[PDB]
From Swiss-Prot, chains A, B:
L-aspartate binds at G34, W130, N183, R374. It catalyses: L-aspartate + 2-oxoglutarate = oxaloacetate + L-glutamate. Changing R374A: Reduces first-order rate constant about 10000-fold. Pfam families: Aminotran_1_2 (PF00155). One of its GO terms (molecular function) is L-tyrosine-2-oxoglutarate transaminase activity. Has been used to construct a 2,4,6-trinitrotoluene (TNT) biosensor strain. It comes from Escherichia coli (strain K12). Homodimer. InterPro entries: Aminotransferase_I/II_large, Asp_trans, NHTrfase_class1_PyrdxlP-BS, PyrdxlP-dep_Trfase, PyrdxlP-dep_Trfase_major, PyrdxlP-dep_Trfase_small. It is found in: Cytoplasm. It comes from the Bacteria. The gene is aspC. This is Aspartate aminotransferase. The keyword Membrane does not apply.
């Protein structure tokens, strides 16, 4: 039965990792990472998390199954975070949240749900985006199309090409938007651009699906939710796939949520029922640990205060690195202008390096980056900044 | 887009639970539960587990993503448990294991894998089986057929009717077997019967898929594996979906595994890669907590000893309850012969009660069971035995 099965291709990252590892060089630098890293180059457990885990250890009296949608408080806390407290969506009971196995899990669940309970056949994803979006939707039997977003020339958001490409999309088609910290350009729309897309979306009959994996990494918790909040105020229906992997550093515990928004309570409840059915047929019910931690932190004034501070430190670490990277480049005698790096949010950005420059960087300098020139700024340290910039300069 | 979505039907167990709760009655008894419960009516966290969690709290330094297949030690430990150490399958490197979000998750993964990488179209499941099996497979777009297994007249395994229905199954079709503690008859084949099915399976060109969720609940760890072990010795290819939810009391942490067996190492590796691709398109990578706990216990001589004893205590509670149940009925003036209850393994059994008898028990006595007459013996206690039996007698 498995004799003729052909090997799946790779996932460059894991491939890059192994190569990195098996490298005897000393000054090696891995910028191909997909997680946050501190000044020492590690991905530590948050202090607030560790505290929450101690609390669970001492209070948990059972590991009995959670409901299909998971922990209730996790759901309400998640909603407040997304829509802000006092939101009508909330007071109107128009949103239902399901705890899922990470952000990817949320995406998959939304996909299976749409594929069996609606007429959706196509999902539009931005270009230069997170490659895993394609596989998730395709796996549910959905068509995936690409809209223009990034401008590899000017390193910016080509709003015209965007609006223009999105005109080829039909009513009932889904359009996927990154809430903030676009992966992997780091280029987000302005509040005014968000409001324009929202207006246009309603006019065209699109079903917006938000991929929100970096809340708090661009400007702050509330700020980062402006775009989504702009859409929510204008739409009857909406879908949000959120992740807590990065902002809580809970990567391996698979913590995320899928939020369904309908015109009214009666409708969201009827629609949510089919979402649960989709879940029951996948993994049955969600993993409690990670989600319990989140609910414990978000609901504790003390712990929450500590966590917000840890998140701020992460955000600022990143902003510092972007700035420090551009300066060290200019100093080291950088041929080109890299100031655009400072206008981009989150951990990722396209360096603008050619495929051949990337290859050279690694072969000759032990500097690791994805062939697309994408780099993870959290892989930079005040310590490695100099050797990094000198290498790059050498390949320009 | 969600205006005309029809509400998903119910899941009686969850419907039963809600009804159970809303019951102001005093002597209520819920035999409709799907989990193990102790003499006090609770589902506690195992001592070995709490110890392992302590250990992780103190030793964990990161929550960085696990590989797609999860923790390596979790895998090797799972394989030893399944095939026994020193197994040729292991030494021959013919099996690859993937950590999944519970047993259900493992099933779903196998399904997606089969659906996209092979010519499988049908999956044969036994009758009087676990209903969720249908939904999982259908979700992947697989056909689900039923084979004869349980004999509701004699309360037994009708080997003949079984061998007979399975004849209509063609080569290349998958047949699903419950490793031990058949859900929900509690009727398992004998070693000799397993061996007969194994010989037949090879001859017919079937692809065996084992659902192993109650290892250690029938006779013991190694005993409960005879069947699967009998098949493994005869097949080139095989798939196993195991769960640790019950035997480790880790319900909500979603801990299970999906093991793939091929003819040789090159083949299983090539096939496993497509299995990883299926995972990546689903939830990305697995939840660490639960699985970490399992690997810690299983690899630590002291903890493992403690866990084995805890598992034994659970198994023994059940066998005791079955015995006590039959006896108390008999002395309560029991009409029918329930002695078959003593020959069934695990938490589940069909009491042989009628849909109307079930409805009456609850309406009149507060005793709760599934309309199918399925009862969970772990729901019984030396304390509630008498009343439970008097109620049953009153409806015979």
């Amino acid at each position: 039965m498995f004799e003729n099965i052909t090997a799946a291709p790779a996932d460059p990252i894991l491939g890059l990792a192994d190569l990195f590892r098996a490298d005897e060089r000393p000054g090696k630098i891995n910028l191909g990472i997909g997680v946050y890293k501190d000044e020492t180059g590690k991905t530590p457990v948050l202090t607030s998390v560790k505290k929450a885990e101690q609390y669970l250890l001492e209070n948990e009296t059972t590991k009995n199954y959670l409901g299909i949608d998971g922990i209730p408080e996790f759901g309400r806390c998640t909603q407040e975070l997304l829509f802000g407290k006092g939101s009508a969506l909330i007071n109107d009971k128009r949103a239902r949240t399901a705890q899922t196995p990470g952000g990817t899990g949320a995406l998959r669940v939304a996909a299976d749900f749409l594929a069996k309970n609606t007429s959706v056949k196509r999902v539009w994803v931005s270009n230069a985006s997170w490659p895993n979006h394609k596989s998730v939707f395709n796996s549910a039997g959905l068509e995936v199309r690409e809209y223009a977003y990034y401008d590899a020339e000017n390193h910016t958001l080509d709003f015209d090409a965007l609006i223009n490409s999105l005109n080829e999309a039909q009513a009932g088609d889904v359009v996927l938007f990154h809430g903030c910290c676009h992966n992997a350009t780091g280029i987000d729309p302005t509040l005014e651009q968000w409001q324009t897309l929202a207006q246009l979306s309603v006019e065209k009959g699109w079903l917006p699906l938000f991929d929100f994996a970096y809340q708090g990494f661009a400007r702050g918790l509330e700020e980062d939710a402006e775009g989504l909040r702009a859409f929510a105020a204008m739409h009857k229906e909406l879908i949000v796939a959120s992740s807590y992997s990065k902002n809580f550093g809970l990567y391996n515990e698979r913590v995320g949520a899928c939020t369904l928004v309908a015109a009214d309570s009666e409708t969201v409840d009827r629609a949510f029922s089919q979402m649960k059915a989709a879940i029951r047929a996948n993994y049955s019910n969600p993993p409690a640990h990670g989600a319990s931690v989140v609910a414990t932190i978000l609901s504790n004034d003390a712990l929450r205060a500590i966590w917000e501070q840890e998140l701020t430190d992460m955000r600022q670490r990143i902003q510092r690195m972007r700035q420090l990277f551009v300066n060290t480049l200019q100093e080291k005698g950088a041929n080109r202008d890299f100031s655009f790096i400072i206008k981009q949010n989150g951990m990722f950005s396209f360096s603008g390096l050619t495929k051949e420059q990337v290859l050279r960087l690694r072969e000759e300098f032990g500097v690791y980056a994805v062939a697309s020139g994408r780099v993870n700024v959290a892989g930079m340290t005040p310590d490695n900044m100099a050797p990094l910039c000198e290498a790059i300069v050498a390949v320009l």
